[PDB]
Design a protein around this nucleic acid. Structure first.
Ligand SMILES: [Mg+2]
Lengths: 557, 88, 49, 304, 132, 128, 198, 101
RNA sequence: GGACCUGGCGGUGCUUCAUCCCUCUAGAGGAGCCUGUUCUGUAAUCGAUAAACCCCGAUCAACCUCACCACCUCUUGCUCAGCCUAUAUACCGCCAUCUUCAGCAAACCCUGAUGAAGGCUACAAAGUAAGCGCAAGUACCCACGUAAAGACGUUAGGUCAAGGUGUAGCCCAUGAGGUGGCAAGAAAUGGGCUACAUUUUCUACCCCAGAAAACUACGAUAGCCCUUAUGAAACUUAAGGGUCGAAGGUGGAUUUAGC
């Protein structure tokens, strides 16, 4: 979806999201202008005709007050026009069918009289609404008329009114549809705060009511049941298994949403090895090798929760099975929105880094990033930790370059982690030179930070690591120059840094450098400075002036 | 794809025309333009309808911009029942 | 359809999504001439009578 | 610079490997010709200028051989004749003069001298016309002198081959014949001359005296055989198409001469070539130009 | 003196791209056409409509990316597709570039009733073939 | 007609008459003359008479963490914006007009004695 | 001062020498210098110069590149599409057997062009061809049919050619060609009284 | 927004001719024959004369579609010679190149 | 006023050239007609107009085109108006001309005492690395040829009527629309076609024929008449037939073109 150009390729997850949003904004602006000036795009020169590229109209044609006009406005989803049409129809006494008023009730209750949102032109159920007004004004009411109002009330969290209207329907001896049953299950669960067994008995009673009414339930029924029972967690754990067994016995095959709801129900802080491990393992064994299909609107979040538990349990084999299930067939399309996909891949890569050999870890890193997602600083830190465990520090410079590609250049935590990992140990001169180049790049990044609106902040550990790497690479002059930053920003020089500086000065026989180190340490008033002073007299050929200066500075002890 | 194919190159056609050069007068000075049309004829022999459709779709979806195509199909047919024997 | 083309480009320029450099030049010249004193009079008001 | 050339060489090697991968061939045996064919297929270009078409040659060829600065870091030039500004040309002249001195110590047909542009490309140095003439004079003095094998090789570096420019078949009945083709203006003819015959020519299946009523066309037909004194000794079947009577006669004449060259002796073939019977005539109609009455006639310049 | 599409040398400092440098008699010799479509071939039709579409597309794209374009467009047509390949300077933030790409693609698709794609290649600065 | 319009460069070349025999000779006095101006000096993409705010082009794409919608400025604020643009253009022109004098030579209309600054620097670290 | 965005290095650097090229270019796309790991150069070089590099090279952008149709890609595409093909009848080895079993040949043309409109009138033409020898006729019927058809019959090739182009659709023209063949055959086998005036 | 008032007149003429083309064809077919009686043909002549003048196709002029130039128009591109040269010399017309032979 | 430099010029010297002249072929200049210009006439365009205008803008005018004229009509008008109104001596754009040229302009360097100025010798003596042009390369059938290309500069060269545009002017009119109309020759001139015939004319044929051959010859694509094509509209345009058989008898200086 992005442009394959270096200047327009997104360099971060934030940049990716922003670029996609900007492209969608441009498309929305174009669509707005097309709809606002349809006369500039009516010239159809396409053969065959392309209806989707023609302008779209949003003006009713049937202007006379009639049932056809009301149905037209309902189809056009013009809530104000539909309400005015119904009012004029009722005042004029013109004929309206039960089906037309049912469609009007569908339109009003689904939106709860809330006006639809276009590009340009909690209990959300309003206490003062025209849906209930028209329902009262409705002379003829049927199963659908009650059902649409109940569904609209439940959708807008008007649970009490929905239950009252269900009682009215039962008194009228009408048969509610399966969707009404699902809405009633949600309303019953969310209406009152009771123990799990009360809601469980209520749900079973509603199911028995459905059995008596001979209505056969659907996937949405059990999906809503589990989603609403998700509150009780441990209380509903085994009863959820009973519901799943009932689903399997009936033949209503669970979809991704059903399993996701069961996962979220069984998910809770504690010991996942008790029951959650069994749940996820059984789900994976059941679903393995099966191509999915769009069955429920919540089918997209299955993989996110599955990978979340995969990371929680530290079972890389389980995560590999989940990923293989995602890759089989068209299951990848169920990975969900951009945020869910990013979270899924972040957890997957974190688990891979934690629990896999560094070679396969690097292969996965190459395969996913940046094609699959853009890593976050924490994921990069985890990868660095895995590399350090593998002792394959030769990749550490490349990773930093990768970080520069992924916008983590200014991430202080990542920079400090990289510097500490590089400067922790002494390595052959090639790796030391690579580390010094990486440290110079990090220093350049610190010099070019966009936080340059006040006196710069220089982490003491970062400065010490950079200086140590430069000294171990032989580039002592840059360390000497950077020594002033410590005094400038009151950042304590490292003891090992001073030791290496003094070692280099003694090897090169440069008493002036030792004097400078002692001056810095005395400016910072570190206790080690005392030893440094002694060492300057002990290891260097000291001139009379320098010896007198050391004797004078000795009084600071 | 296991299809017999032969290639040949029909002679090119170079359409030429002439326009007056200057915006005003100077009739004796002109500019001559041309539009070369190069050809390539591929003859595919003895292939079924499904294979023909697949190959045509594959080569048409990949047809480069600036290249037109005119595919001529010879459809083998059997005599209709009215012609096999005289109704008379 | 020159009507469609010209009206579409003019509308886009008013919406700010099309920078008509030629029209900007024309507007600048028009502003300078109006400062100089060259303006269209009202209809039915020909200077020659 | 030299480091830039090294980077370009590395990039070219990587690109050669990538192109071999793309075309599914062995990278180790992917020659320059394969590179050119792959580039032409992947990046087709109908531009007439071959130098304008896409190219992914070696940097040694893409970059001019003038090289980077002719001195190292110390600034000392590599060549001892650098300050002459024409170190290549003057080094070549010095070597030729040394060869002439050694020749003094010790003691035409299929090649021409390379043009000044070719020499400039050889030495990647700009040269003047008089410089080229001086070098050519020195080379020719070297050649005229008793040049040895080494001097002959040295000259052959500057020798350019001159552009100087037949089958016998048997029919189903064992009649040995030769077949040839000829063009003249727009007429194209194909002739078949049999080794043994009694002077019978069939043009388009029609006898020549009935196909060419004009005596001039029959004289043109007679010309090749009469030149080699083989009148009445060969049978000819020829087919001509296009053009007028004289163009067809000329095309048939050329085709007959070329075919008969397969039977006459080599000296006779040379005589026929010297008589002009084998050279395809390039005289073709010249296009009319705009603003003019014809190919060369201008419009009548108006009276003043 | 011929004046068509030629950049006359003035001082030896004015930079020109590859296309601006070459004169009209170099078309199909050292520079290809900036628009490729089957309209001008033998026997084909609707050449005038394609020419008008190309002119309008060039004007619209030049006026939609003010100063962003670093060279002429390339209008390729495959079937009913329409690819506008452009070279753009790296002036604007990529957000504006993406917004303009989406806008222009949707608007041109709805205006010409064909799927229009817009491919942008960014350059740091206008490529200089030579100086005149 | 839209198709009859040209680009800014062509229009400036035509109107300014920078080339031609008149510039070479100067027989026609041009005290009343035209000078080149940048019509795109301060124009922002997505700004026009209608005063629309296009998210991602002339207004921030995300405001308070949410994607902005197509919004149109009120007439009063759009008028203020247009007036501010006019004033900014006037300020730019005024800053262009202002300049700083120099020091005369031996006499007010003689080049003698006028300094020319340092000689141009040499090719390799050879400065003056 | 707002920060200035730095362009990333091209992804050709991250590519591998032994990667799968068709993955990079699955479909026809313009030449992207950041995506083609080849040091290709195009453009007439200046005096003592080199051809222009690919970055910003409009000449390469003009070329309808075949980078999406490499031989590996073509082979993979054909392997995928083999499932869609149907084997030609092995019995019909030569055109002789084809004429023996299928004596009617229908010629039609499909024109592919660049543009928003796919309509083309020349696609409505249908050409039916049949050898009179392959038909079932006697001497009199053949002689009458030849006179009826007129120029549509070439005695040299013994092929009757009926060209239908008067109907808006190709299927209508094909139906008309079949109907014309039917009526011509029936009238040929029909004998009129006035035919005795021959 | 056409180039000039002459282009506007041509557009109006083309529109009216398209509107009246069917009736003009029918009446002309009634006229251009010898089968029908002479009186009916004279009535048809009067009727076709009574039609609006601008509906006559002969009044349609093939002006350039970009500069309204009434001459030098190449019918294949509907552009004046000057505009066609301007576009072709810049390479913006596919397959059109300077002819040299 | 003295000396010198550069240019212009010399009824200035010398040398060497070209189509400058002669030589070759076919024409123009004589006739008729086509067309263009000019003039006259008319109520009735414009522009080009020495080479570099004169079958030119036009690759095209009965209405339209059309910008002209007469009469009539409209005023926010197809256009966030309009103008084919003035200015090509404000310009872009596209070209003419030398050019059937090879030089041009920057950036340096050197000479003259660091004066204006000058800068070449090939067995070379201060000129030059780059840019533009020639050249090269390319198109057509070759490497030849023809195209294409042909810089800078010259003629305030041509075009405000392709379009755009500066300035100036018009806004109940210099804008917009409708109907109708020119367009004739007393002429002069430019280009072209057909001829004045016997190497011709007619027929057959496409080159082995038969007739014609000076008052019933050659010679009109002219005139007159009648059809036909196109068109709404044709003595207007075109084609065809009929009729008429005219001027003319190879044309002066001079002049065009060709390798
Ligand atoms: Mg003064």
């Amino acid at each position: 979806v992005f442009q394959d150009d270096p200047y327009l390729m997104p360099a971060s997850s934030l940049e990716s999201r922003s670029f996609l949003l900007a492209k969608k904004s441009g498309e929305n602006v174009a669509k707005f202008i097309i709809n606002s000036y349809p006369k500039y795009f009516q010239k159809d020169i396409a053969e065959p005709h392309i209806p989707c590229l023609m302008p779209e109209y949003f003006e009713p044609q049937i202007k006379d007050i009639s049932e056809a006009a009301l149905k037209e406005r309902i189809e056009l989803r013009k809530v104000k026009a539909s309400v005015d049409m119904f009012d004029q129809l009722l005042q004029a006494g013109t004929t309206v069918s039960l089906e037309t008023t049912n469609s009007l009730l569908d339109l009003l209750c689904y939106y709860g009289d809330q006006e639809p949102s276009t590009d340009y032109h909690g209990v959300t159920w309003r206490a003062k609404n025209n849906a209930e007004r028209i329902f009262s004004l409705m002379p003829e009411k049927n199963e659908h008329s009650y059902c649409t109002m109940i569904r609209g009330m439940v959708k807008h969290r008007a649970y009490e009114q929905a239950l009252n209207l269900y009682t009215e329907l039962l008194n009228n001896r009408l048969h509610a549809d399966v969707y009404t049953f699902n809405a009633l299950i949600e309303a019953t669960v969310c209406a009152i705060n009771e123990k799990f067994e009360e809601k469980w008995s209520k749900i079973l009673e509603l199911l028995r009511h459905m059995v008596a009414q001979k209505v056969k339930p659907n996937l949405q029924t059990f999906n809503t049941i589990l989603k609403c029972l998700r509150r009780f967690h441990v209380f509903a754990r085994s009863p959820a298994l009973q519901v799943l067994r009932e689903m399997k016995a009936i033949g209503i095959e669970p979809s991704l949403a059903t399993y996701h709801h069961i996962i979220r129900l069984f998910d809770q802080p504690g010991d996942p090895l008790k029951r959650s491990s069994f749940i996820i393992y059984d789900i994976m064994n059941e679903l393995m090798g099966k191509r999915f299909s769009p069955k429920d609107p919540d089918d997209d979040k299955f993989f996110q929760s599955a990978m979340s538990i995969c990371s929680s349990l530290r079972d890389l084999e389980l995560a590999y099975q989940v990923h293989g299930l995602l890759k089989t067939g068209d299951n990848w399309k169920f990975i969900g929105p951009d945020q869910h996909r990013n979270f899924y891949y972040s957890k997957f890569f974190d688990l891979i880094c934690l629990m896999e050999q560094i070679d396969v870890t690097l292969k996965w890193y190459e395969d996913l990033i940046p094609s699959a997602y853009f890593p976050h600083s924490q994921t990069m830190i985890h990868l660095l930790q895995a590399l350090d465990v593998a002792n394959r520090l030769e990749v550490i410079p490349k990773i930093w370059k990768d970080s520069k590609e992924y916008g983590h250049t200014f991430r202080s935590d990542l920079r400090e982690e990289i510097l500490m990992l590089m400067a922790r140990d002494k390595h052959p001169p090639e790796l030391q030179v690579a580390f010094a180049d990486c440290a110079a790049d990090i220093k350049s990044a610190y010099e070019s930070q966009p936080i340059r609106q006040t006196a710069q902040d220089w982490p003491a550990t970062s400065l010490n690591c950079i200086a140590i790497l430069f000294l171990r690479a032989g580039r002592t002059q840059e360390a000497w120059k950077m020594l002033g930053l410590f005094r400038k920003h009151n950042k304590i020089p490292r003891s090992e840094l001073l030791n290496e500086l003094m070692d280099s000065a003694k090897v090169s026989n440069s008493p002036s450098q030792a004097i400078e180190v002692v001056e810095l340490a005395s400016a910072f008033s570190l206790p080690i400075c005392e030893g440094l002073t002694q060492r300057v007299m002990s290891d260097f050929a000291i001139n009379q002036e320098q010896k007198e200066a050391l004797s004078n500075l000795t009084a600071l002890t | 794809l296991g299809i017999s194919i032969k290639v040949h190159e029909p002679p090119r056609k170079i359409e030429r025309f002439t326009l007056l050069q200057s915006v005003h007068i100077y009739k004796k000075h002109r500019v001559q333009y041309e539009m070369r049309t190069l050809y390539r004829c591929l003859e595919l022999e003895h292939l079924t309808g499904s294979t023909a459709d697949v190959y045509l779709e594959y080569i048409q979806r990949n047809l480069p911009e600036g290249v037109a195509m005119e595919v001529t199909k010879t459809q083998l047919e059997q005599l209709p029942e009215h012609i096999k024997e005289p109704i008379w | 359809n020159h009507h469609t083309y010209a009206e579409l480009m003019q509308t886009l320029r008013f919406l700010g999504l099309y920078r008509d450099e030629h029209q900007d030049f024309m507007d600048e010249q028009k502003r300078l001439k109006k400062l100089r004193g060259k303006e269209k009079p009202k209809k039915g008001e020909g200077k020659r009578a | 610079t030299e480091d830039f050339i090294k980077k370009q060489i590395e990039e070219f090697n990587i690109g050669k490997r990538h192109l071999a991968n793309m075309m599914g061939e062995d990278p180790e045996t992917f020659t320059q010709e394969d590179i050119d064919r792959a580039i032409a297929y992947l990046f087709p270009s109908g531009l007439f200028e071959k130098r304008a078409r896409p190219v992914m040659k070696h940097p040694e060829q893409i970059f001019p051989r003038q090289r980077a600065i002719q001195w190292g870091e110390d600034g000392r030039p590599f060549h001892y004749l650098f300050y002459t500004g024409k170190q290549s040309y003057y080094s070549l002249m010095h070597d030729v003069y040394g060869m002439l001195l050694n020749l003094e110590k010790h003691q035409v047909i299929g090649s021409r001298w390379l043009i000044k542009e070719e020499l400039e490309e050889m030495l990647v140095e700009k040269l003047s016309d008089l410089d080229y003439m001086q070098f050519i004079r020195l080379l020719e003095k070297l050649l005229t002198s008793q040049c040895g094998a080494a001097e002959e090789e040295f000259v052959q570096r500057f020798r350019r081959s001159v552009t100087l420019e037949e089958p016998v078949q048997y029919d189903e009945q064992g009649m040995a014949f030769s077949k040839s083709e000829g063009k003249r203006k727009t007429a194209k003819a194909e002739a078949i001359v049999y080794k043994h015959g009694s002077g019978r020519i069939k043009v388009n299946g029609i006898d020549y005296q009935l196909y060419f009523p004009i005596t001039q066309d029959r004289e043109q037909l007679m010309f090749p055989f009469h030149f080699v004194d083989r009148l009445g000794k060969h049978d000819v079947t020829c087919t001509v198409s296009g053009g007028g009577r004289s163009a067809q006669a000329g095309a048939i004449r050329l085709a007959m001469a070329k075919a008969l060259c397969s039977f006459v002796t080599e000296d006779e073939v040379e005589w026929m070539r010297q008589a002009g019977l084998l050279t395809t005539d390039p005289r073709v109609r010249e296009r009319k130009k705009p603003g003019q009455e014809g190919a060369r006639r201008k419009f009548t310049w108006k009276k003043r | 003196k011929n004046r068509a599409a030629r950049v006359r040398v003035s001082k030896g400092d004015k930079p020109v791209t590859y296309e601006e440098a070459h004169a009209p008699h170099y078309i199909a010799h050292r520079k290809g056409w900036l628009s490729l479509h089957t309209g001008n071939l033998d026997g084909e039709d609707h050449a005038a409509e394609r020419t008008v579409e190309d002119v309008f597309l060039r004007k619209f794209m030049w006026g939609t990316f003010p100063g962003c374009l670093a060279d002429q467009l390339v209008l390729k047509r495959r079937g009913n597709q329409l690819e506008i390949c452009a070279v753009v300077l790296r002036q604007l933030s990529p957000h504006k570039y993406y917004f303009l790409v989406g806008y222009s693609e949707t608007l041109l698709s709805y205006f010409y009733k064909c799927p229009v794609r817009l491919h942008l290649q960014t350059v740091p600065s206008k490529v200089v073939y030579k100086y005149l | 007609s839209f198709f009859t319009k040209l680009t800014a460069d062509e229009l400036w070349k035509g109107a300014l008459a920078e080339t031609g025999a008149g510039a070479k000779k100067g027989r026609g006095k041009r005290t009343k003359k035209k000078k080149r101006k940048d019509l795109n000096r301060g124009q922002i993409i997505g700004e026009g008479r209608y005063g629309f705010l296009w998210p991602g082009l002339n207004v921030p794409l995300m405001k308070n963490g949410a994607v902005q919608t197509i919004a149109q400025r009120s007439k009063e604020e759009q008028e203020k914006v247009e007036a501010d643009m006019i004033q900014q253009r006037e300020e730019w022109d005024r800053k262009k007009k202002m300049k700083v004098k120099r020091e005369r030579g031996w006499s007010g209309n003689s080049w003698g004695g006028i300094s020319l600054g340092p000689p141009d620097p040499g090719p390799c670290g050879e400065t003056y | 001062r707002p920060p200035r965005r730095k362009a990333l290095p091209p992804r050709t650097e991250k590519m591998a020498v032994d990667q799968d090229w068709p993955s990079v270019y699955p479909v026809a796309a313009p030449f992207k210098p950041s995506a083609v790991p080849l040091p290709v150069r195009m453009g007439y070089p200046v005096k003592k110069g080199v051809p222009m590099a690919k970055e910003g090279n409009l000449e390469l952008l003009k070329i309808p590149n075949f980078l999406h149709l490499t031989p590996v890609a073509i082979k993979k595409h054909c392997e995928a599409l083999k499932d869609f093909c149907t084997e030609w009848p092995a019995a019909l080895d030569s055109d002789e057997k084809c004429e023996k079993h299928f004596p009617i040949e229908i010629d039609s043309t499909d024109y592919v062009s660049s543009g928003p409109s796919v309509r083309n009138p020349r696609a409505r033409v249908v050409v039916l061809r049949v050898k009179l020898s392959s038909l079932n006729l006697d001497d009199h019927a053949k002689k009458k049919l030849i006179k009826l058809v007129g120029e549509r019959y070439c005695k040299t090739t013994d092929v009757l050619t009926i060209k239908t182009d008067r109907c808006p659709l190709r299927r209508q023209n094909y139906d008309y060609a079949v109907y014309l063949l039917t009526v011509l055959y029936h009238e040929s086998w029909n004998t009129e009284e006035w035919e005795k005036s021959k | 927004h056409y180039v000039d008032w002459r282009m506007w007149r041509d557009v109006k003429r083309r529109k009216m001719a398209y509107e009246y083309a069917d009736e003009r064809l029918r009446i002309n077919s009634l006229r251009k024959n010898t089968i029908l009686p002479k009186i009916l043909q004279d009535v048809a002549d009067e009727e076709i004369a009574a039609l609006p003048r601008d509906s006559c196709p002969v009044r349609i002029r093939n002006r350039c579609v970009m500069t309204s130039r009434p001459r030098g128009v190449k019918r294949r591109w509907r552009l004046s010679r000057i505009v066609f040269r301007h576009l072709a010399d810049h390479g913006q017309l596919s397959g059109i190149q300077r002819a040299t032979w």
